[PDB]
């Protein structure tokens, strides 16, 4: 089966270099072009260039001439993207995608017909920190909302569950927001019956693997 | 560089609908146009190549047509797995260029937000910071507006917001906004309020609290 499997996510500091690999299986790498596509968060797709898989020659789109290098590792059936001198603006997902070589009269699609799953690169000078978890206490004034504010952590992601996963209905866990500190914050809320507030215990379970931080925070009406 | 334009960035539709997505090019591309689908999970596949040829394994409900500078992708009987973002892409010349993408969402009846405000916790305040949270829950359509007021002064620049993706069960959106103050600033004022407007609300909804009550 035709597959392009890319390397996993990377967290880098400005000025560093990253190498993204794209392993071809189920087809002969050397028979197709290989393209690189960038998607910044917010989701525009931008073609960065391609590498001639037969000769090894790379061709860069103009906005990507300088700090980008396409390479082949044929004995590993792998194509690679290296970004040097990373900037915060390089924070994006990078896709590799193959395209059948064009020749007059061909029957193949001249399209990027199989894509890798994408490699997310995050560039930041922030240092790793576990979150503080604060209650969003249900109002004392039907349906009530409560939640947890998971503040000041790096890097993404955190996982939030309620009552160890026994509470899923009415839960909304919001996208993280990047603060000017360089640290992330997110909120998780759930709506419950107002009548349940005096009798049901509500606990948000927060896990931040990069910092080995786990927190079980009970959220209760404030006295 | 040939510019590709998808005039409609967001399109609401119902399951079963016929849905059309337009794409315009800044010059004649002689039908050298491909269509890609990106799922919410981020994975990409080609749907159509050379304006109207279905790629292998793409179901027959997808089709495309056009010429010159005007092109379109059509889904004849929309299904749940088709809720995604569709991009066009020219290959008439280098650099290959993409349109801005058209993200599908499910249509439903208008739903007004339920609004909730949350004071900062005593634990956070001890640390020197106060986060005030306003929740706009389960509304439709996605467009909503809110204003933070502190002792009736409109606050602009000291809050951040985020919005969920469309809910899989009720097709609504939720929004969370966080107002951040220093402890000393938080204690200088009394009334903290979030005021919300939405096409589902016949008049604005204000939720507020008095610090320390």
Backbone shape of chain B: elongated
**Distinct helical segment count of chain A:** 0
Please tally the β strands of chain B and state the result.
19
CATH architecture field of the largest domain in chain A = Sandwich
Put simply, the count of helices of chain B is 2
The CATH C-level class name of the largest domain in chain B:
Mainly Beta
Largest interface: A-B, 45 and 50 residues
Helix content of chain A: under 10%
Structural class label of chain B = mainly beta
Find the count of extended strands of chain A (DSSP E, 2+ residues). 19
Please name the CATH architecture of the largest domain in chain B.
Sandwich
Number of domains of chain A: 2
> What percentage of the residues of chain A does DSSP assign to strands (E)?
over 45%
* CATH homology group of the largest domain in chain B: Immunoglobulins
Major sheet characteristics of chain B:
7 strands, mixed
PDB class: immune system
Keywords: Anti Human LAG3, immune system
Assembly: dimeric
Entry title: Fab Fragment of Anti-human LAG3 antibody (BAP050)
Can you walk through the features of this model?
The complex is a heterodimer of chains A (223) and B (213). By secondary structure, chain A is an all-beta fold. Chain A has two domains: 3-123, Immunoglobulin-like; 132-219, Immunoglobulin-like (Sandwich). Chain A contains no helices and 19 strands. The N and C termini of chain A lie far apart (61 Å). With 213 residues, chain B is mainly β. Chain B folds into two domains: 4-106, Immunoglobulins (Immunoglobulin-like, Sandwich); 114-210, Immunoglobulins (Immunoglobulin-like), CATH 2.60.40. In chain B, 4% of the residues lie in helices and 49% in strands. In chain B, strands 2, 4, 5, 6, 9, 10 and 11 form a seven-stranded mixed sheet that branches. Chain B has a four-stranded antiparallel sheet with strand order 1-3-8-7, with no helix packed on it. Chain B has a four-stranded antiparallel sheet with strand order 12-13-17-16. In chain B, strand 9 and strand 10 form a beta hairpin. The interface between A and B is large, with 45 and 50 residues. The PDB classes it as immune system. Keywords: Anti Human LAG3, immune system. The assembly is dimeric. The entry is titled "Fab Fragment of Anti-human LAG3 antibody (BAP050)". Chain A: BAP050 Fab Heavy Chain. The organism of A is Mus musculus.
